[PDB]
Amino acid sequence: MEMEKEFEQIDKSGSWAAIYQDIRHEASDFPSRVAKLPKNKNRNRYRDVSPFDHSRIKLHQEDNDYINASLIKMEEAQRSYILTQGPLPNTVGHFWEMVWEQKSRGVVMLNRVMEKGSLKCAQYWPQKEEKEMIFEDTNLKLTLISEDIKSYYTVRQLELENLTTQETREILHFHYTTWPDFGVPESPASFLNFLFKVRESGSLSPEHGPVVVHCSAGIGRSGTFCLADTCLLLMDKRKDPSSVDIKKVLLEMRKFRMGLIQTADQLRFSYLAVIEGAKFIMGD
Ligand SMILES: N#Cc1ccc(Oc2ccccn2)cc1
């Protein structure tokens, strides 16, 4: 059923809350035993958001291999994403270790450091060229190379150095800066442009490790980003673009990380983004 017609049917009936709860009811439930170990309590921002054991990212160290991050592997679409929480003061070094070990080219950030007058994640990147950051626990160095500030997002070029081997890599930071404190954007126009800006970069492409995507918990806005990307790519390689079932794609992604899409407004916004993004893909 063409999703644009399904959309108008849900909107006219005002059943967004009822659709959303059906997804919550059918979603996968797998063990998260490593996340709940007492040694890992200060590695978790929220007590109710944990990565499943089967899909969690492991740090390459014998001490403690735990980070709040999950590998989402989509098969027909042939895309991988790592979805993680906003780093904590004690997990900034773990975060950059993961970016290094997984060979990621891009980091996507969908939140501000402060929202609603509270801290949503640590200041984990350098703000000035001449004041670089060193993470002593993971032996990494991070330098701001350049910054391009636009109206809806900022792109930063960073240099990450493995102080152990003296190899360096260029990491692109894509920072979406205008998601509102409450609700969802009124139009998906600025959100879709941003995805194409990550796309254009090569950060989503198979010659690199998976893109690292985060918000505060790494399920809400982060969920919206990878659901829209995957839906639009399937609409491209399939004879009938109308086959694409946004809900069934979202249940496949919830097999890898719990809670993706946190509200009925985020679910509606995901529909709008895919519907709009498809008009300039089906050849416009
Ligand atoms: N990559 C990918 C992917 C494609 C399809 C998926 O689920 C369905 C199932 C039946 C009809 C439509 N979509 C889930 C993931």
The answer to whether the CB of 232 is under 6 A from ligand 1 is no
The answer to whether the CB of 251 is under 6 A from ligand 1 is no
Number of structural domains the chain divides into: 1
> Is residue 216 annotated as involved in ligand binding?
yes
Q: How far is the CA of 33 from the centre of ligand 1 (A)?
A: 28
The answer to whether the CB of 77 is under 6 A from ligand 1 is yes
> Is residue 217 annotated as involved in ligand binding?
yes
Q: How far is the CA of 202 from the centre of ligand 1 (A)?
A: 24
> Is residue 57 annotated as involved in ligand binding?
no
> Is residue 181 annotated as involved in ligand binding?
yes
> Is residue 221 annotated as involved in ligand binding?
yes
Here the CATH number for the domain that contains residue 228 is 3.90.190.10
H or E, element range at 211: strand 211-214
Q: How far is the CA of 244 from the centre of ligand 1 (A)?
A: 7
Query: Residue with the nearest Cα to atom 2 of ligand 1?
Result: 76
Tokens of 242: 């109308």
Q: In b/e form, how buried is each residue of 11-41, taking b as 16+ CB within 10 angstroms?
A: eeeeebeebbeebeeebeeeebebbeeeeee
- In 3D space, the residue among 283, 256, 251 whose CA is nearest the CA of residue 267 turns out to be 251
Q: How far is the CA of 248 from the centre of ligand 1 (A)?
A: 6
Number of alpha carbons in the 13 Å side-chain half-sphere of residue 275: 15
The answer to whether the CB of 76 is under 6 A from ligand 1 is yes
The answer to whether the CB of 252 is under 6 A from ligand 1 is yes
The answer to whether the CB of 75 is under 6 A from ligand 1 is yes
**How close are the terminal C-alpha atoms of the chain, in Å?**
22
Q: How far is the CA of 172 from the centre of ligand 1 (A)?
A: 30
Is residue 204 within 8 Å of 198, Cβ to Cβ?
yes
Domain residue limits at 222: 1-283
Helices (H), 137-278: 189-200, 221-237, 246-254, 264-277
Q: Which residues are catalytic?
A: 215
Q: In b/e form, how buried is each residue of 106-131, taking b as 16+ CB within 10 angstroms?
A: bbbbbbbeebeeeebbeebbbeeeee
Indicate the SS3 state at residue 67.
strand
- Specify the amino acid at residue 156: R
Query: Residue with the nearest Cα to atom 15 of ligand 1?
Result: 249
- Residue with token string 């969908």: 110
E strands along 5-127, which residues? 56-58, 66-74, 79-84, 106-109, 114-115, 118-119
